[PDB]
Each structure stands twice: as structure tokens, then as C-alpha cells.
Amino acid sequence: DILAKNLFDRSHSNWAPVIDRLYVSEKRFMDIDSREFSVWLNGTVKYLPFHSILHLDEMLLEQINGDVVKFNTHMYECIFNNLGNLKPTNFNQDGTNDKVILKMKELLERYDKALKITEERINKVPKMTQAILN
RNA sequence: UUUUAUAUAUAUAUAAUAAGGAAAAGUAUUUAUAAGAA
């Protein structure tokens, strides 16, 4: 029923019902191939609301069992694109307590972690792309 | 472009994928001065 109400209208594809379904569902994203799934998710899922982007973030975490190192480029790109496409809820006068900015630095620090845990394990690697900076 | 996917020997040939969209009104003194004709 979820595919019918929103996805049928080509102009505006609303993926909040879909993400909410797959977050409510116990199966979530586990047991799904990282590669095909990352490319599809990045390609199609855009303009998500903030809470949807959260649920998607933790549920990719649960897909990958919480291994920061495995977390691929396209995964970053999807989360970052959705975060950026969000407009500010309100222009706070100081304008530094935004949620999106904090989650954005959270993801960057997570990347730094993943790199450090990979190097420590030594004792493909993820990359940053112009899309994330943009 | 970039990122990944397959294949082959870190690299090569192919396929797919593209983040840059903002609206608004009103806010003088100029300077020195070079002419040709039969």
C-alpha cells in the first residue's frame, strides 16, 4: 500500500512512509547486499525529512552490525545529500545549534574513526568526494 | 567529472550512478595648453 500512495506520483516521491515501514519492520536492512543496496539507496532516496534520515542512519548501522570501517562511500553520499537538501528549520540568530550541522560533524568524525580503526587493525577504504563537501 | 560493479593482469577494459536555485523597497573645482603662409 505504501508504494501506491506516494511513489506512484512521479513528480514527488515521498520515501518517509517507506523508511518508516522498514524501521518499524524487524527485518530492517539486515541481510541485504551492501553494494547494490548502497547504489540504489543513493540513487533514488533523496529529500528525506530529518527524523527519516536519522532512522536510515541507525538502520544502516544495524545493517552493517555497527562496523564503522565497512561503511561505504555511497552510504555517506546518501546521508549527506539528504541532510543537505533539508532547509534550516529556523535561522537561529547565532545559528550554531542546528541539528543537521551537528549530525554532519558526527559523520565526519565517524569517518575519522573508521580510518583509525582500519589502521589499528593493520597493527575498500572509504573516501571523501566533492559531493559531501558541496 | 567523481564513486562504485564485473572481468583481466596495485593497475587496465567495459556498465551505472551528477551534490552547485538566490528572489524585496529605500539608502562643481576636471586643471597645462603648442595654428601657419608664399
Q: Can you give the three-state secondary structure of chain A, one letter per residue?
A: CHHHHHHCCCCCCCCHHHHHHHHHCCCCCCCCCHHHHHHHHHHHCCCCCHHHHHHHHHHHHHHCCCCCCCCCHHHHHHHHHHHHHCCCCCCCCCCCCCHHHHHHHHHHHHHHHHHHHHHHHHCCCCCCCHHHHC
Å from A27 (CA) to B7 (C1')?
34
Chain centroid to CA A125 = 18
Å from A47 (CA) to B15 (C1')?
27
Whether the CA torsion A69, A16, A78, A51 is positive or negative: it is negative
Q: Are A50 and A86 in contact, with CB atoms under 8 Å apart?
A: yes
Å from A48 (CA) to B38 (C1')?
96
**What are the C-alpha distances in Å from A94 to residues A88, A90, A97, A98, A101?**
13, 11, 8, 10, 13
Q: Nucleotide B1: nearest residue by CA–C1'? A: A130
Q: Are A42 and A76 in contact, with CB atoms under 8 Å apart?
A: no
Cα distance between residue A76 and residue A57, in whole Å: 10
Cell 514527488 sits at which residue? A12
Cell 524501521 sits at which residue? A23
Nearest nucleotide to the CA of A80, by C1', is B19
Burial class (CB in 10 A: 0-12, 13-18, 19+), A25: exposed
Å from A46 (CA) to B26 (C1')?
41
Q: Are A76 and A102 in contact, with CB atoms under 8 Å apart?
A: no
Whether the CA torsion A53, A58, A64, A66 is positive or negative: it is positive
Nearest nucleotide to the CA of A84, by C1', is B19
Q: Obtained via which technique? A: cryo-EM
Nearest nucleotide to the CA of A38, by C1', is B4
Q: Are A19 and A51 in contact, with CB atoms under 8 Å apart?
A: no
